[PDB]
Amino acid sequence: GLSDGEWQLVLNVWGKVEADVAGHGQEVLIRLFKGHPETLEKFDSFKHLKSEDEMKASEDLKKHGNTVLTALGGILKKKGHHEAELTPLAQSHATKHKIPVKYLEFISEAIIQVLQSKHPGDFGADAQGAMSKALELFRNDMAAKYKELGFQG
Numbered sequence: 001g002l003s004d005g006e007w008q009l010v011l012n013v014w015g016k017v018e019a020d021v022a023g024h025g026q027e028v029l030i031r032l033f034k035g036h037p038e039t040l041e042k043f044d045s046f047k048h049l050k051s052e053d054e055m056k057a058s059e060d061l062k063k064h065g066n067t068v069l070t071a072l073g074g075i076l077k078k079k080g081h082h083e084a085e086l087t088p089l090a091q092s093h094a095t096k097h098k099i100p101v102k103y104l105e106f107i108s109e110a111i112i113q114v115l116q117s118k119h120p121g122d123f124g125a126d127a128q129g130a131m132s133k134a135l136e137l138f139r140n141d142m143a144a145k146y147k148e149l150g151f152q153g
């Protein structure tokens with residue numbers, strides 16, 4: 001875990017995302033698709049997008065962006081007590097979506113890149129380090145759920 005002080009820095013930076021969830025959501029997915037093109041192959045719905053301008057115009061890529069960050073905000077707010085919010089996500093992603101754990105790592109980096117690009121003034125050394133342990137915790141718990149569902153990539 002994170003210390004009480006580290007969860008506080010995490011919740012505080014999250015207050016910035018919550019002031020514009022779909023806009024931050026939309027940039028996280030463009031960063032991911034631009035950055036690791038191969039993750040795009042998992043979305044039937046989006047494989048047609050051939051460029052950043054097309055991804056930027058997609059009202060559906062923006063609604064999916066919103067859904068991902070709304071679901072991640074619900075986990076973060078539990079501060080580590082997220083079993084229940086997490087199980088269902090580990091079940092769909094392992095079994096239905098078939099998302100390997102390095103892909104969870106690539107989205108973690110897109111989230112940090114977005115926070116840094118849009119809130120540099122608020123996203124200092126300290127907030128950067130808490131945010132990154134908070135996302136490694138999420139990944140590590142998801143990978144553990146994977147293993148007991150008996151899968152794993």
Ligand code: HEM
Pocket residue numbers: 039040042043044045067068069071072088089092093097099103104107
């Ligand atoms: C921060 C990590 C993530 C969160 C919180 C998250 C959350 C969600 C949620 C809430 C849904 C809708 C319900 C469901 O099927 O469970 C969803 C669907 C989906 N997710 Fe994720 N996700 C994450 C990472 C990823 C990654 C890394 C990929 C693949 C590169 C991915 C692929 C998918 C697909 C293919 C679907 C179905 C989307 C569709 O309707 O076509 N997810 N995700």
